Structure 1
């Protein structure tokens, strides 16, 4: 029923505000200059990278860990710490999706293990434009061209996220749209190894109707936006399959890699 779906939508948005400190609206205010506080330091090369860390003089122990390597490894290493925080944030949000915590525990685990990267790329787009990406709570900006320039495999991790972002961003979703899209991703009844598919699909279906109504109301002039958004779920899946192949390239071409423990769990025997 409409009132039910509108109230589902407001719940997820409210909870999305509570779970994700840097929302699209705040990322864009920062991207755009509209903010009034502190303009982000841009990293375009080795020297400004050095200075970007070396900002640690009127800056602090930047929540990540410590670095005994080179540029390409060090950047991939700062990506891991951020994706670990994103996973925590996304798990905290999932628990608020009505019906999620009442599911079989193994199913909750599998839903998260498969959904979490799709959602990291979805929301990474929020922080991106065609020239670069906001990093460190919006205190920095790394250029697309710098990330793309990185030695073979590392450089290969970056570009396809930017090509995705540019296209997803042209859909002009805002946070309240995104909040339902991401819950829809989480509640995917076709993740490998699910014990109890139907009660997951029943929830997804109801999220789907809510996302539908939210796009009609919020973007009345935008034709077939709902479909165009669900088409994006396959751009997402292909980013993940690509990312995973690139991860295998990293075991071969690199010395001691071993991701953060929680990410190794995520990647352990994945699709």
Structure 2
């Protein structure tokens, strides 16, 4: 009926870690290769994703216990989940009014058509945008948003993980926190927890579709040469 002292600590450090790795001013975006509207948007969006992967690694390293995993498991979890955390964290710039991601300036406003010009089809972009509006309607508390990112990252059902028992226990503790938080602190959220777990399921499907479309891009060197070294390493298929 009331959040434990250790549960709120988990929340505090997750919230701080998110504020430390998500810049609401988006001022860093000017450093990316500019947008062009072939695949005219592939250079800017590749820089956007690469920058975001660095943020997700920074967030991950501040989840309680993630750092104490082996370096192999840390990589396994990041390589499988990175695109999912990006889709999740991007909800913070998504707008229902424009059905797009608005990152400050109009040059950093990304329509669906912008993403197609980066090598992606409606097969991915249709369910991605539906995922964003539905996640947006949930009206998540900041505490809930960050817990969902952390739960998604700490999934033991990823290819490559070895310490299944440890990762599951971490993820369990995070779900208990989320469930308690919603119960105590979110009025009218008796159905929210289930809805959020459903969004995790949607992310697996978006991940699958993104992986398929990334694969075709990376098999064409005139496109893959536009990617960054971090993108190719993280979304690549090498195994540690």
Please tell me whether the aligned partners of residues 95 and 101 of structure 1 are also in contact (alpha carbons under 8 angstroms): yes
Normalized against structure 1, the TM-score is what? 0.76
Runs of 4+ with >4 A deviation? 150-153
2:232 is equivalent to residue 264 of structure 1: yes
The equivalent residue for 1:53 is: none
Per-residue CA distance 1:23-82 (angstroms, 9 max, x = gap): xxx89xxxxxxxxxxxxxxxxxxxxxxxxxxxxxxx999211368xx7362312211111
Give the C-alpha shift of residue 91 in structure 1. Answer: 0.7
The equivalent residue for 1:118 is: 84
Give the alignment of 1:225-244 within 5 angstroms: 225-244=192-211
The equivalent residue for 2:59 is: 93
- 1:73–1:191: structure 2 CA closer, same or farther, 3 Å change rule? same
Aligned-pair Cα RMSD in Å: 2.9
- 1:226–1:267: structure 2 CA closer, same or farther, 3 Å change rule? same
- 1:5–1:268: structure 2 CA closer, same or farther, 3 Å change rule? same
Normalized against structure 2, the TM-score is what? 0.85
Distance 1:61 1:174 in 2: 26
The equivalent residue for 2:212 is: 245
2:183 is equivalent to residue 216 of structure 1: yes
Please tell me whether the aligned partners of residues 119 and 217 of structure 2 are also in contact (alpha carbons under 8 angstroms): yes
Higher CA-based Rg: 1
Aligned residues: 232
Distance 1:164 1:96 in 2: 26
Distance 2:118 2:75 in 1: 34
Give the one of 138, 148, 154 matched to 1:187: 154
Give the C-alpha shift of residue 202 in structure 1. Answer: 1.0
2:10 is equivalent to residue 4 of structure 1: no
Give the one of 136, 142, 167 matched to 1:175: 142
- 1:61–1:239: structure 2 CA closer, same or farther, 3 Å change rule? closer
Distance 1:219 1:187 in 2: 23
Name stretches of at least 5 consecutive residues in structure 1 with no aligned partner.
28-58
The equivalent residue for 1:84 is: 50
Give the alignment of 1:132-211 within 5 angstroms: 132-135=99-102, 137-140=103-106, 142=109, 144=111, 146-147=113-114, 150=116, 154-156=120-122, 157-211=124-178
Please tell me whether the aligned partners of residues 40 and 117 of structure 2 are also in contact (alpha carbons under 8 angstroms): no
Distance 2:73 2:58 in 1: 16
Please tell me whether the aligned partners of residues 76 and 154 of structure 1 are also in contact (alpha carbons under 8 angstroms): no
